[PDB]
Amino acid sequence: KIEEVKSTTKTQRIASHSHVKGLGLDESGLAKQAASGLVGQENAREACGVIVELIKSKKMAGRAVLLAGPPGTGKTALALAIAQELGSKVPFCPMVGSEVYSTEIKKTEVLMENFRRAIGLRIKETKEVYEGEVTELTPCETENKTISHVIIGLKTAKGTKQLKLDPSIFESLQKERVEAGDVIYIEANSGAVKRQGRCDTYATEFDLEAEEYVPLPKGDVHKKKEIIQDVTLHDLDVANARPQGGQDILSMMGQLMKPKKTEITDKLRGEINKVVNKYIDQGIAELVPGVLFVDEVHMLDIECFTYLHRALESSIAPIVIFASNRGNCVIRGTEDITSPHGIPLDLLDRVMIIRTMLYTPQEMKQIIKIRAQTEGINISEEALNHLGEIGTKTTLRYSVQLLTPANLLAKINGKDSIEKEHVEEISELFYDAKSSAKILADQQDKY
Amino acid sequence: QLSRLHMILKPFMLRRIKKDVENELSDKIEILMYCQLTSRQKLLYQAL
Numbered sequence A: 001k002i003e004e005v006k007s008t009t010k011t012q013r014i015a016s017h018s019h020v021k022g023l024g025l026d027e028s029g030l031a032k033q034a035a036s037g038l039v040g041q042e043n044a045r046e047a048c049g050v051i052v053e054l055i056k057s058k059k060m061a062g063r064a065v066l067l068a069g070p071p072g073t074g075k076t077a078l079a080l081a082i083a084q085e086l087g088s089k090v091p092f093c094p095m096v097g098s099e100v101y102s103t104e105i106k107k108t109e110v111l112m113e114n115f116r117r118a119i120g121l122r123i124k125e126t127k128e129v130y131e132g133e134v135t136e137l138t139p140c141e142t143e144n145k146t147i148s149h150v151i152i153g154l155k156t157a158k159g160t161k162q163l164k165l166d167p168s169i170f171e172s173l174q175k176e177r178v179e180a181g182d183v184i185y186i187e188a189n190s191g192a193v194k195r196q197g198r199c200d201t202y203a204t205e206f207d208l209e210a211e212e213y214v215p216l217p218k219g220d221v222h223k224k225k226e227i228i229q230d231v232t233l234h235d236l237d238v239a240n241a242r243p244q245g246g247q248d249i250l251s252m253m254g255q256l257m258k259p260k261k262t263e264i265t266d267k268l269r270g271e272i273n274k275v276v277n278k279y280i281d282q283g284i285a286e287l288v289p290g291v292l293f294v295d296e297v298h299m300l301d302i303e304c305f306t307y308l309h310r311a312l313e314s315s316i317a318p319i320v321i322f323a324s325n326r327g328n329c330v331i332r333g334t335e336d337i338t339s340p341h342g343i344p345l346d347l348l349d350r351v352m353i354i355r356t357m358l359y360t361p362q363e364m365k366q367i368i369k370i371r372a373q374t375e376g377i378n379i380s381e382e383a384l385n386h387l388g389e390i391g392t393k394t395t396l397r398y399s400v401q402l403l404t405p406a407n408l409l410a411k412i413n414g415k416d417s418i419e420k421e422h423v424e425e426i427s428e429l430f431y432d433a434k435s436s437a438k439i440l441a442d443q444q445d446k447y
Numbered sequence B: 001q002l003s004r005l006h007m008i009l010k011p012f013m014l015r016r017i018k019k020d021v022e023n024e025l026s027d028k029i030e031i032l033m034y035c036q037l038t039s040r041q042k043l044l045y046q047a048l
């Protein structure tokens, strides 16, 4: 009769690009007027439909596209649209142009770390494991005393079996404090041992106890399973740089040291390339190269604008997306040479420039309405028009910013929607980047 | 039809129900409870 429901988990927060859901193109390759949260920029959204096909062709390697335009014109919005269109499986690497300055590794090497992180890989691995409750454990002895064999009895639901294992497995078992009656899970690819606690049968033995009890495992004592794994080249490279696998003492104690980055040499990269090629030839490894997104590219030091010449002419380097919003500026680290967008001409010749233009007042209202319905606020027509004129006066970012506090004041006094009075009062409370400049230049002598 | 069927089945059948025989039996309370599907459930429902 009485219907009751429960819902206590909170929703996700709203970012600055939470409404962009795709490029919103058509099958013919043209650009709509308003689709998937994007309006306008037809000449730029159409040019981004070529790029997604270029990514999905898995053919080229070492192509760069540079999005250029005034601030607030939707560069990174287009980049996130491309990333959303390409799907989750394709690896996407966000990056800021100011991250190449590090105190541990050189500027040049971070670019490689990001390139190798951009390229993905899919592996179909097979792991054979022995699981179950230990019923008997015995270390064998031989001539020096040393240990040569380990005898382990594992009892699953199906039954029990006895196994002879390498002394390294015995060392790992003694390391984890494994006795009889404790459920264990050993994998034979790496020799790792995991203890889950005593069996559920030994529950009433002790009135007071601290160990957790797991039920008896079901299935066979020894079994192999297939695991599908998504990895990148940079994961293999970093794992082989400072290894942590294995049950020895060198890697165990390397697991505890401070994780400092290191400069990977060309030899390890080449050997990893050979190994992954061998994996591909076996019909298991599938390559899925992705996209690296470099934002604010205009502030890479000249030592990074020039290594990219050799870094992009490679046959492995993925597709790189640049983004800049600067005019004829001086190149950082040069103090004498000026160039468009800060990027030098020599590197600029290797990129395809996607021009971006400023927005018209008509699209401003549509963008504001889309953002308002994304946040979850209701705005009247006159208030939306007033926000439109405000945006035409200063910028659309300011209009988007004003949407939330206006709703706050609207819901303070019982109103359910934003009115013109709320927008005007908010515009009075907060200042623009240009009005504040005026009131600052008026009193410049006294600051 | 229904009246004819009731007349036909009236002689060689009985019935009591709960009011005739329950002299002290609290009326059971029936409660519905909607439950929302989780993330994984939704990924699978989408696949389906």
Ligand SMILES: Nc1ncnc2c1ncn2[C@@H]1O[C@H](COP(=O)(O)OP(=O)(O)O)[C@@H](O)[C@H]1O
Pocket (backbone or CB within 6 Å): A016, A017, A037, A038, A039, A040, A041, A069, A070, A071, A072, A073, A074, A075, A076, A077, A078, A325, A367, A397
């Ligand atoms: N075509 C568009 N459709 C929807 N929103 C847009 C569009 N272009 C820009 N925006 C919005 O404008 C805001 C600022 O633009 P942004 O993407 O940061 O450009 P830039 O990187 O050049 O400053 C973003 O939050 C974005 O949501």
